[PDB]
Amino acid sequence: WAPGNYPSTRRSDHVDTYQSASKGEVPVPDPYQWLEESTDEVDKWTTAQADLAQSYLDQNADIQKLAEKFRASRNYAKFSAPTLLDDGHWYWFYNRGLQSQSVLYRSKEPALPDFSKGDDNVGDVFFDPNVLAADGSAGMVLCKFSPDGKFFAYAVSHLGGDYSTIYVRSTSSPLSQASVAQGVDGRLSDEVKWFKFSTIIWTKDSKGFLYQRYPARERHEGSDRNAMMCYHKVGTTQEEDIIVYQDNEHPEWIYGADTSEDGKYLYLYQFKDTSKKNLLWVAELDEDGVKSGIHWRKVVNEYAADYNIITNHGSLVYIKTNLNAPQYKVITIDLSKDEPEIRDFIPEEKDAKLAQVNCANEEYFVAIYKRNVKDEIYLYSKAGVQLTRLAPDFVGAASIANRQKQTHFFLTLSGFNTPGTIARYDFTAPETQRFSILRTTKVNELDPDDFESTQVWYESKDGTKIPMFIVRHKSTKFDGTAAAIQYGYGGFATSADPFFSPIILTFLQTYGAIFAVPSIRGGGEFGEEWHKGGRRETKVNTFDDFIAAAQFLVKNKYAAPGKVAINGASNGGLLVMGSIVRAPEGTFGAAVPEGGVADLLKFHKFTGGQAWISEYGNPSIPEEFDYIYPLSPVHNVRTDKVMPATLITVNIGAGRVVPMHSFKFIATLQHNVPQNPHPLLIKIDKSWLGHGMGKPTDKNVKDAADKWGFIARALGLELK
């Protein structure tokens, strides 16, 4: 590769006209409009680009070395929390280390295993999703056991497919290499097609489950509208499924459900966009079970807040909500009254987000609070008294795993240097012996104790103080010499939580680099106001926050000048692409946007773009075009600014941002600064991933070595 050696990219005469509130009609040339299409010409162009990128990476002999180190760092057994089913047996996922899909195991004995003996010594395979297809083209993307433990419902996606299909099997019928060689699959004939974008919710009689589906679509027919919440009865075909709810007048809205443990209530959630606002309707179930013509009580019938059911006791329903409470709280709504009475059960904390609440042991509550972007776990009594903090020395991210009716619960704990701890709380144990560690994840080659994470605060352009995690190998100094990889997402109220990555830690140890995770506005770290601080008309703050983080790393000698690289995916790819356009020349030394939005004027004209109007605004509204257009990366590339080395990565598939965003952005970079001194490249994986499907592990390792090696070489880092 050399500057100016990019594939020829045709420029059309296409112009789109938009209406600006401040400037009236604005004509916007779109010379790469044709990259919106799927054609021979586009295939040759993406092939030329991917060949150019691979040619450049081929010049870098260190990538293969990183692949070896990265594969080894991933090669350690991994496992989930176990779940006790009503058959008395415990089920958990187990991965031998490098398997592409983890395998669902079942305890040999009706007792909690001593997992120190080894998963294969205490459990047998129950469901191995690797055998769904002999060539790995099918993945299990969601599953749910029935409450009585007799059935296992599982959603399957295929390469090339745009929906998932739900299947059902008896829990006494394993799916394994042995079972498929020795006989038929063993599942029921049920085949529930057209499923996507909800969970699977069993009724508590275990007769069936609720799931969202879309209209059947022929190959050359006509978009994803007219979602329906449906009910599937086990042992029937889908033509007998009941439509529980649809709304022809609002064909864009989607649906969720929940069922109360006591069998009394069916709950319906409705969502009109990606804001955290939903309707909440409540139906009473009887002997008649789930039926068409269900009567809904429209308890929450305006879009104003997030409501998610926790549990109920009789007609008193406990709900996690952010109604008038942007850090969230628990309310009760008493349905015994004509006008429901609404009360705070666990009040909002001004400065800590209530992130999750589960009912445990029938009448207790386990709450996770996120304070300064670090999770804290507490146990509450039925009277709302905070009893104890669990795992008080844990620093990182926590989740709860339990079933409300049982006498125990688990916590799953991980963080930058905590690979994966599963703790157990046993209410039947003596009062000082209730909390224990069930399993700790043991990693390979790496020693997590060799790494430190800390949290520092910097100031954004408008004065706002923003926290940022910094992770380093403990021999790395903050003396103005390290490289930094700065990661972000920056949207949709998603929190940039601690997480464990053996590949990142291996990179940090290999090169003496640091990893930086700033909690930029648009995320949900500090509740819904933090999200509102970076969305629609304030979305510019997300970019200012991310740019100020990189400037702070260099100014305060965490990292060397010009040695901050940035990386992010989906919304985080938009973050990366807009950041390199907006920041002063030299702010970044490398950039890897993964599958981002980049045409912020046309994003809502494609597939899943409409739902994002709540996050970015609507380009077709003149007042909103005026704040979108200055931020749109495709429309703000200059000719006078040196760009960092950039490797754009694109994965094709269901539910992913359409790739024309990345295509237009890289075509526009190579048109505007063809002689850039640093390579501006794009790598496309043309396999069509189905919904929820990942790539095989070996491809993931190869892609990681390419990405991190590209960054290392761009920043001048050498293998010691």
């Binding site: 991933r74 989930s80 749910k144 433990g149 599963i422």
Partner: peptide, 18 residues
């Protein structure tokens, strides 16, 4: 999906399966 493609998800994959 905060870290959905970048890290193995086995640890939390059992939290809500019944």
């Amino acid at each position: 999906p905060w870290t959905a493609e970048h890290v193995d998800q086995t640890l939390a994959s059992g939290n809500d399966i019944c």
